[PDB]
Each structure stands twice: as structure tokens, then as C-alpha cells.
Amino acid sequence: PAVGIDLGTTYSCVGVFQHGKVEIIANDQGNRTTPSYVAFTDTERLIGDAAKNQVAMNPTNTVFDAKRLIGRRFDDAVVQSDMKHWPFMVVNDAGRPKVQVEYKGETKSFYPEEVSSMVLTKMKEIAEAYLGKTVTNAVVTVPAYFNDSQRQATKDAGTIAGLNVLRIINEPTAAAIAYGLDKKVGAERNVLIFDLGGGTFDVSILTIEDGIFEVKSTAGDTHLGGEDFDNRMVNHFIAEFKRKHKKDISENKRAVRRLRTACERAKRTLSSSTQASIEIDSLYEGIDFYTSITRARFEELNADLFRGTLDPVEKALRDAKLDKSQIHDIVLVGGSTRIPKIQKLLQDFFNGKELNKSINPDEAVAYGAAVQAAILS
Ligand SMILES: Nc1ncnc2c1nc(N)n2[C@@H]1O[C@H](CO)[C@@H](O)[C@H]1O
Numbered sequence: 001p002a003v004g005i006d007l008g009t010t011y012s013c014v015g016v017f018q019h020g021k022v023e024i025i026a027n028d029q030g031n032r033t034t035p036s037y038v039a040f041t042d043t044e045r046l047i048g049d050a051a052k053n054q055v056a057m058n059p060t061n062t063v064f065d066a067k068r069l070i071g072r073r074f075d076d077a078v079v080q081s082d083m084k085h086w087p088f089m090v091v092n093d094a095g096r097p098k099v100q101v102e103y104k105g106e107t108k109s110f111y112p113e114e115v116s117s118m119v120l121t122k123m124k125e126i127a128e129a130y131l132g133k134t135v136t137n138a139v140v141t142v143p144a145y146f147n148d149s150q151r152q153a154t155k156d157a158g159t160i161a162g163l164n165v166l167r168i169i170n171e172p173t174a175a176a177i178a179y180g181l182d183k184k185v186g187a188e189r190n191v192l193i194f195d196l197g198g199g200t201f202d203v204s205i206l207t208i209e210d211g212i213f214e215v216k217s218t219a220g221d222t223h224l225g226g227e228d229f230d231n232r233m234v235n236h237f238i239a240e241f242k243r244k245h246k247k248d249i250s251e252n253k254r255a256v257r258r259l260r261t262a263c264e265r266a267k268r269t270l271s272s273s274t275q276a277s278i279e280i281d282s283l284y285e286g287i288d289f290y291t292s293i294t295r296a297r298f299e300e301l302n303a304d305l306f307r308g309t310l311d312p313v314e315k316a317l318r319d320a321k322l323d324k325s326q327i328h329d330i331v332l333v334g335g336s337t338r339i340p341k342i343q344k345l346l347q348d349f350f351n352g353k354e355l356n357k358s359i360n361p362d363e364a365v366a367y368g369a370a371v372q373a374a375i376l377s
Pocket residue numbers: 197198199225226227264267268269271334335336337338339362
């Protein structure tokens with residue numbers, strides 16, 4: 001048995017192709033994705049949901065975003081920038097980062113691939129728990145923009161985890177494979193993959209001919225995601241609370257958290273209904289906050305951000321020397337692509353071209369990796 005693993009920046013996903021169909025595997029908590037989080041305590045190492053859950057109680061010993069570090073030099077522009085907002089320590093070991101933590105009271109240091117190997121170990125165990133079998137063979141995916149060093153450190157993270165990494169496959173290729181875009185025949189096709197998650201936006205153009213892939217271009221915005229959309233909702237409701245109660249809730253961290261959690265939940269509802277209601281009792285100074293938001297108001301609050309996703313798309317086309325008419329297939333990846341307005345902007349931009357969106361966009365990369373893993377095994 002071989003598994004496909006989407007090793008994601010914030011969440012990871014494992015699938016297995018068995019009995020003619022991909023099964024996306026639920027973890028011990030019943031979650032079909034697992035936070036890419038590792039935490040070190042006085043007594044134990046926590047990975048996944050258990051790690052994410054205690055981040056507030058232990059921020060400096062709880063590691064995430066290791067994929068932003070993996071295979072990079074310490075002085076990489078990216079390593080330097082994201083370092084500013086990570087509560088965990090990143091030390092410089094002869095030009096390449098290690099994370100330093102306190103573990104069983106004893107101060108310990110880890111290469112980014114050692115941390116990623118821990119996440120991969122979790123995904124491996126998640127697979128073994130479901131199957132009741134040993135799992136060694138895996139396909140692991142990476143972003144299309146990853147260099148040799150980033151790809152090799154990812155493969156290494158797997159080997160340390162005890163995986164036999166059959167192949168490192170690009171995430172947009174795996175997404176394409178999930179939709180069987182590689183089974184189409186005759187003429188060369190151009191495929192755009194639109195990947196919008198919680199934090200990041202990635203665009204890729206590939207060519208496929210007779211099931212042979214090539215990456216043509218990549219573009220994006222490394223800080224545009226559903227988290228930005230939540231911010232606009234929060235700002236909207238803080239102003240509303242100010243308007244109706246002449247009270248500023250924004251310096252109360254717990255009130256703002258309640259609102260924000262409520263906001264991202266409402267956002268998800270707005271992807272399948274046209275209004276969402278929120279009741280938060282005793283939000284600030286004992287004042288209840290009952291409110292509602294239409295899909296249209298949500299769209300209005302995010303108008304610039306939503307339209308702005310089209311710019312990396314134009315860039316990707318430019319760099320691939322392709323006209324928007326020369327795109328044959330469009331594939332949706334990432335949770336934020338569930339937004340109808342985003343789908344309409346993309347569906348319209350391509351003159352009304354259809355979209356591959358039937359596979360759960362959170363799971364499509366693991367899906368394709370799992371299909372490829374069974375073929376390669
Ligand atoms: N149905 C939905 N509508 C809008 N956004 C959704 C969404 N589902 C998810 N996960 N998201 C967002 O995807 C990101 C990664 O999970 C987060 O920003 C989620 O809110």
C-alpha cells in the first residue's frame with residue numbers, strides 16, 4: 001500500500017487509492033486534514049491537532065510554518081521576513097536555520113526537515129491506524145516553485161520519517177492528476193491551477209500532452225488568503241458595534257477572538273447560503289452582539305482582494321507566453337476557492353470557461369498524490 005501526502009504549510013492531508021477509489025484518511029480526531037504543527041512540553045512531543053490546540057498555552061515551544069523554512073538558507077529573504085512573526089526561536093547553524101525549543105526541560109534544536117519529518121511521521125501513523133497495515137511507500141508533494149534544495153530537504157524529511165518516497169510531485173500536477181487531466185488525448189493542453197488557501201495564493205500553468213507534464217509558469221501572493229477575508233469581516237463588525245453601542249471592543253483580545261472565530265464560520269456559510277447570522281452573548285461590557293451579513297455585503301467588503309486574485313493569473317499567462325484563450329482547463333485548489341464570487345471572477349475572466357472543482361479543494365493535492373502513489377508502487 002502506498003499513500004499520497006500533501007505536506008501543507010498549515011494543514012497536511014493523506015490519501016490512499018484502494019478498491020478503485022481514493023480514500024482521504026481521517027486522523028485520530030476524525031479530521032481529514034491535520035495541522036502541520038509540532039509542540040514540545042515538559043513531558044512529551046505533540047503533533048497535529050493536539051499541538052495546534054495548546055499553542056496559546058505554549059507558543060514558544062509550538063512550531064508551525066516549517067515549509068516556509070525547509071531547504072532555505074538562514075539569510076533567505078523569506079526566512080528573514082516570516083521570522084518576525086514566529087514565537088518560536090530560529091537559530092543560525094552555519095548559514096542554515098534550526099528551530100530551538102525547550103523539550104522535557106532540556107533545550108533542543110531541529111533542522112526544518114526534522115520538524116517536517118515529525119509531521120510526516122504523524123501522517124504515516126494516521127495512514128497505518130486506518131489501514132491496519134505498515135505504510136512505507138509514499139508520494140509527497142511540494143510547491144512548483146520549490147528549488148533543488150527545497151525538494152531534497154522535503155524528500156529527506158520523508159526518509160527520516162521512515163517513508164520510501166516514490167516521487168516528489170508538484171502540488172498543481174497532483175491536482176491535475178486528481179481530475180484525470182493527464183488521461184486526455186491528442187493535442188497539447190494548457191492547465192491553470194488556482195490555489196487559494198488560508199494564508200497563501202499560488203497560481204501555476206502547466207502543459208500536458210499524452211500524460212506528460214511540464215511547468216510553464218508560477219505566480220502568486222504569498223500573503224493573500226481566507227485570513228485576509230476574515231479581517232475585513234472583523235473590521236466591518238467592530239465598526240458596527242461602535243456605531244450601535246459607542247463602544248470599542250478592539251483592545252479586548254477575547255472579544256475580538258470570539259468575533260473573528262464567528263466571522264470565519266459565517267464566511268463558510270456564505271459559500272452555500274446568501275446570508276449568515278451571528279449571536280455572541282455578552283461580547284463586550286456585557287453587551288450582546290447579534291448581527292447578520294449577506295453574501296453580497298461579504299463580497300463588497302472583499303471586492304478589491306477578490307478581483308486582485310486575477311493579477312497573478314495575468315502574470316502567470318504573461319510568463320507562460322499564453323493568452324487566456326489558450327487555457328483548456330482550470331483547477332481549484334485550497335479552501336478559499338469555495339467562495340462563489342472568486343469562482344465567478346475566474347469563470348468570467350476566462351470568457352465563461354468551466355472549472356474543475358468537484359474534488360474537495362482542501363483534498364485535491366493528496367487525492368492526486370494517492371492516485372500517482374498506487375501507480376508508482
Ligand atoms: N466553504 C468555505 N468558504 C470560504 N472559505 C473557506 C471555506 N472552507 C474553508 N476551509 N475556507 C477557508 O480556507 C482556508 C483554509 O482552510 C481558511 O481561510 C478557511 O476559512
